[PDB]
Design a protein around this ligand. Structure first.
Ligand code: HDE
Ligand code: HDE
Ligand SMILES: [S]
Ligand SMILES: [S]
Lengths: 726, 726
């Protein structure tokens, strides 16, 4: 017995806030959270308590501390089969990482539609509001390895595996509504350009290098998703606070055989929020696991990630009614033109048990559709259909990857396929071919029908010659970048300029920077000039006269493209740093902690050391982390209670905590004599918007703080930080 | 879509300083640099200029921009074999990363001994000072994935493949002289404990989490290598400025058959230097590729990494003469007791061409020895011999990994092994077995002897029963951690305390912290008290009375265990940031660059934007990076020349640049009105050791700065940095 007698090694099996208890496997943290998929995995879940340690062959091990040797200082013997099994398994633990989206964090949950969608699709999962579909979702970055950092500037993946009664449906989306390239044939060129360069394998998790910008400069189709990546969209606060999109026009197919074009949306019910660049970059160093950690802890805390599934629906007859081609994956469909219709709600409510087994081996692929859905001729989507099945053969070791437990359908599956590496299912069918008489032709084909029918493709008319040719309709590259730019707030536009400027400054060959600047001048002159100024580049008279691209169907902005133009803030699940001193005013802390609790906002009590401090009234205050150990990067706001301020007033880390949080536009609240820290961040006596201050933490001090937090960051402070040395 | 007319896309094929040219494949950067191994790879090197783009079958491609489809807006066709080859290759790019040391950076070079070692070993590569052996070296961290960051706190790997005339010898070392554990049977337990925890796969690149410290608290054998990891040895400045060690006692065997025990050492000719934790951690965010980059650039610049091979030699009759067991890999052999004998010099002078082909697929293994070397019964080394061959079967896809070009011996290899996946060699031998008459028994066994003989094991006597039992002589855990502790300077001790304090503060379960502090009390009470204080823990009376472990064979300290106690600075290949203004005083810059150049010290010119600024005399100065884009983390010292100081005096980034450099103990030099920045870092008029200042940058000013840089950091400043908010 090595566990502590007080049982403090084991986390409570109840929802607890971030940092209160060690984290655990989902079935141990939340044993009563169930769904049909989680239940169906019970056959392979393996426990441990009270069991004897064995080899894989079930042989009990007596000494797991020593190899077998001739004499206690002698050579190890080949007949040590316990040593060799154990080391063999270790020696083969690793499998190939995903070619792209290798870095990803995942969770189980469930989806339910708001109402039946039978008028527009025969998809069984969308047929009845009382139909619950288990999901498994993996969020990811794109470029970096499985051991790269979470808060890089990159697109994010948002993949949802729906375990439906009529088969697996994978909705394999991203956090922007378009992609960099038009045709799947170029995907290796694009990916190679953004990935670490091949001579030296640098840089990790970054597009800020020559080959990416070289490619972008020579392939203007990429400019739209580049605008998105350079904006604060490229640096989300949390997977809970970004949008999701299905990237392509697909089809819905109803029982009557009518096709409707659809683009898929996920709206984050926690709101849209992003970091700022300096914060995101520094955070890759201070906690490269920050998003994986935040997702896991939100789920353990009961702050379940929730998203609303939405559809943009376009009738068959309206295929050609836009300025852009619906099948072009570099074009978005503005919500002002085609609204998103609410469809249903997904809640992620349980972490996995074993990350490797459930997360690393999960296979998602957009060809996994079900009756009631179908594809289109989008030439990016068309190639994806090839890639996601082929790649599993090396990644997951062969064609039986659907038998890896997380991948298994909960719907029945029976067919005539046999064998392959790792074959688990033992087929008893006397036949392995059809048609057969020896088993009366079972399992049998099923006609298409309104429910429970076989899959049949929509009979779309095809007419043309066999060509390798880009549609002329796809040859417009600047209008959507422009629409995106004009839709952003002035502070968002500033962060876009700064992303381009920062990234191009890492491009070693100056001609590439110049070429990119030329492309910016084809989108918007103010943008092009601002980036040019940061790069010491002067636009030519010609570049000054490039006429801007047309409006998109008469639109000059669409506010749904902004993260922040329309408020959607939610504070629940956010976190506040509380900077302790050695004699805190206990009435300030009561008021602070209860107000945060009442709104679902977490707190972490920080100090210059671990252990405890004692408040004015003798209350013993447990310390979560030190100032340097849990930097302001990791919180949404900072509160300093009154008390013995002289304890920390000269602590460099405590001052720096506030400068860093100030620079990154976070709300800061100072009570009583904590107002002496005003001088550290240079705040005028009469105060400033975004700094909450009062004699004490009572009255409106906490409501004012929470109002700031609902608006995420203090954008008005941007001109003030510009000269802060932090 | 083509190269600029000025040819600026292509790096000069001459040595150039970091940042002067884009980096490039080694064979293009330094085509005249050769050795036998580099030449032998010519069969597989593939160029590209003037060649047609083809499928892998040699078919020229007409349109690499589009998929084949039925009409230009139609579905992609299955007969597009060009698309599917290209996509299939992409979909299968990744192979499993190494189970440990997945993150690593490699280069080519050569080794030669100083004199013949034939009195002690018959190894051919140590037999003649004029016999040059090609080497390929990979440096690594241990815990993190291939996409994790470089400047983590971790042990570093240092693996050298010697391509000798009598076979490949791989010396597979680390940058500390011991390991965490005693018996290879426990390697998977230790590695699992340090690696990301299995439920959520956090943390990456960090031992700062509950499972690692749980293991350490329960296995006091780990404490010696933990001491080393918590010291600044865990955060080297560069692979060029760390020591390497072979980890085990091996044997040398001479022609007469005499065995001598040996431990291997690499001495960095650029001297020993490490980061400080705050700097190392922030650098994982600002440049996760810093060590990989610095190595590649040092080789491009001609600052070739050089190491001296050294041997500790112990006669067979002295096996039992120390108070520790020679075969215990948790124990070091103090250089005060057994001096390192200089053996030869290794120079790394070319970067690879393709990181995947040469670095990622290289396989090193300590069982790859040659006649003249042999093993011992070290029970860690014993188990390693199983693992390094076994693991290659999944990692490199089969038993023909020696045919992968980087791995191939330059010495002849012929034997009766056949087949296996991706078999390259076509054997013509009528026989695939021996003995055979049908090929007159070729290839044939060769007797052992003085040179070019067959391998025979040294006939060590073995006497004991078949037991799984740890040698009693291995059961001492505290004396070597204490010797290490006592050998460190006071500032190195403070950093060790701070490493333990920071790490244990991230351990969520407090009892684990308490148990680690109790272990520390068995090593040194001063260390234990100082960690406990930081964790808010009070030592008990029993803990205060624990008797310190005994001295190691009479030693109270051994200064060769310290990074810094004995000066060994070398400034060549270091780098200074030079903070520009818009009217630099050219006279200052001229003298600065001249003094730096004379000592092989590089410079980076930084400003608040990219492009150019013009000096007082018309000199146009190109800007390498912005103050934010290349932070003081990345340089060794900072110089601010005179001129129009008002231009940058109020710049937040420029002021911060100095604050960060000051905090991290780096030399700072301020000329003319740049002395105004003294106010940002609180230097009194009188000045301060480690801040160089004068009316202008002259002979005297540069000499002082260069003197400080030879001592690496300004340790005496440590008391002054607590207060700086940076
Ligand atoms: C719409 C969102 C989107 C788009 C447009 C693309 N990816 Fe993804 N991807 C793979 C291939 C692939 C191709 C061929 C194309 C355009 C032709 C895209 N991508 C663009 C893949 C290599 O087959 C992939 C890697 C491993 C795997 O199983 O499939 C793959 C990954 C991926 C993910 C991660 C899913 C997961 O396992 O967590 C996501 C969210 C996307 N892609 C989105 C996506
Ligand atoms: C003393 C230097 C040292 C020590 C003591 C060990 N490693 Fe290493 N290691 C593998 C297995 C293994 C075992 C079983 C033990 C102790 C029993 C050690 N290690 C401790 C490996 C799985 O075979 C390995 C991973 C991938 C691979 O090809 O080999 C491996 C790697 C490794 C490297 C990396 C070499 C490289 O590719 O650059 C180094 C420097 C060590 N180990 C050193 C080492
Ligand atoms: S997409
Ligand atoms: S070792």
């Amino acid at each position: 017995s090595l566990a502590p007698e007080d049982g403090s090694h084991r986390p409570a099996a109840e929802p607890t806030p971030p940092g209160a208890q060690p984290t655990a496997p989902g079935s141990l943290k939340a044993p009563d959270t169930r769904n049909e998929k989680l239940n169906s995995l019970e056959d392979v879940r393996k426990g441990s308590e009270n069991y004897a340690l064995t080899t894989n062959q079930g042989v009990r091990i007596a000494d797991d501390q020593n190899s077998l040797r001739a004499g206690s200082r002698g050579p190890t013997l080949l007949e040590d089969f316990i040593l060799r099994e154990k080391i063999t398994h270790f020696d083969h633990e690793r499998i190939p990482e995903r070619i792209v989206h290798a870095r990803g964090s995942a969770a189980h949950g469930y989806f339910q539609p708001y109402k039946s969608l039978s008028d527009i699709t025969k998809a069984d999962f969308l047929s009845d509001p009382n139909k619950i579909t288990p999901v498994f979702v993996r969020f990811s970055t794109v470029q970096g390895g499985a051991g790269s950092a979470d808060t890089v500037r990159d697109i994010r993946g948002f993949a949802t595996k729906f375990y439906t009664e009529e088969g697996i449906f994978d909705l394999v989306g991203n956090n922007t509504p378009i992609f960099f390239i038009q045709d799947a044939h170029k995907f290796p060129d694009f990916v190679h350009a953004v990935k670490p360069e091949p001579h030296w394998a640098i840089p990790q998790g970054q597009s800020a290098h020559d080959t990416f910008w070289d490619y972008v400069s020579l392939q203007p189709e990429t400019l739209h998703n580049v605008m998105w990546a350079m904006s604060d969209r490229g640096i989300p606060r949390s997977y809970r606070t970004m949008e999701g999109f299905g990237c392509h026009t697909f089809r819905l197919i109803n029982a009557e055989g009518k096709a409707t074009f659809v683009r898929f949306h996920w709206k984050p019910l926690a709101g849209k929020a992003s970091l700022v660049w300096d914060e995101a970059q520094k955070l890759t160093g201070r906690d490269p696991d920050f998003h994986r950690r935040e997702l896991w802890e939100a789920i353990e805390a009961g702050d379940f990630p929730e998203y609303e599934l939405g559809f943009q629906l376009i009738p068959e007859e309206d295929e050609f009614k836009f300025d852009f081609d619906l099948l072009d994956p570099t074009k978005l469909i503005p919500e002002e033109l085609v609204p998103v219709q609410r469809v249903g709600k997904m809640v992620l409510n349980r972490n996995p048990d074993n990350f490797f087994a459930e997360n690393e081996q999960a296979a998602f692929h957009p060809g996994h559709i079900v009756p009631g859905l179908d594809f289109t001729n989008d030439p990016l989507l068309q190639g994806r259909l090839f890639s996601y099945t082929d790649t599993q053969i090396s990644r997951l070791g062969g064609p039986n990857f659907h038998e890896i437990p997380i991948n298994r359908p909960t719907a029945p599956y029976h067919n005539f396929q046999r064998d392959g590496m790792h074959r688990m299912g033992i087929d008893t069918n006397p036949a392995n071919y059809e048609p057969n008489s020896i088993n009366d032709n079972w399992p049998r084909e099923t006609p298409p029908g309104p429910k429970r029918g076989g899959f049949e493709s929509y009979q779309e008319r095809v007419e043309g010659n066999k060509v390798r040719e880009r549609s002329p309709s796809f040859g417009e590259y600047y209008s959507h970048p422009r629409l995106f730019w004009l839709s952003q707030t002035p502070f968002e536009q500033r962060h876009i300029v700064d992303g381009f400027s920062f990234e191009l400054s890492k491009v070693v060959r100056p001609y590439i920077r110049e070429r990119v600047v030329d492309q910016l001048a084809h989108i918007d002159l103010t943008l092009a000039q601002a980036v040019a100024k940061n790069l010491g580049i002067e636009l030519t008279d010609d570049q000054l006269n490039i006429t801007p691209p047309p409006d998109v169907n008469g639109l000059k902005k669409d506010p749904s493209l902004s993260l922040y133009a329309i408020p959607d803030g939610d504070v629940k699940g956010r976190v506040v740093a509380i900077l302790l001193n050695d004699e805190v005013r206990s009435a300030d802390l009561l008021a602070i902690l209860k107000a945060l609790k009442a709104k679902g906002v977490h707190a972490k009590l920080l100090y210059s050391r671990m252990g405890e401090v004692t408040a004015d009234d003798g209350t013993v205050l447990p310390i979560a982390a030190t100032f340097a150990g849990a930097p302001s990067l990791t919180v949404d706001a900072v509160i300093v209670p009154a008390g013995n301020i002289a304890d920390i007033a000269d602590n460099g880390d405590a001052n720096y905590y506030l400068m860093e949080a100030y620079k990154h536009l976070k709300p800061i609240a100072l009570a009583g004599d904590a107002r002496k820290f005003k001088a550290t961040i240079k705040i005028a006596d009469q105060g400033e918007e975004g700094i909450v201050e009062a004699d004490s933490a009572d009255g409106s001090f906490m409501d004012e703080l929470l109002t700031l937090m609902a608006a995420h960051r203090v954008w008005s402070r941007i001109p003030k930080i510009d000269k802060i040395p932090a």
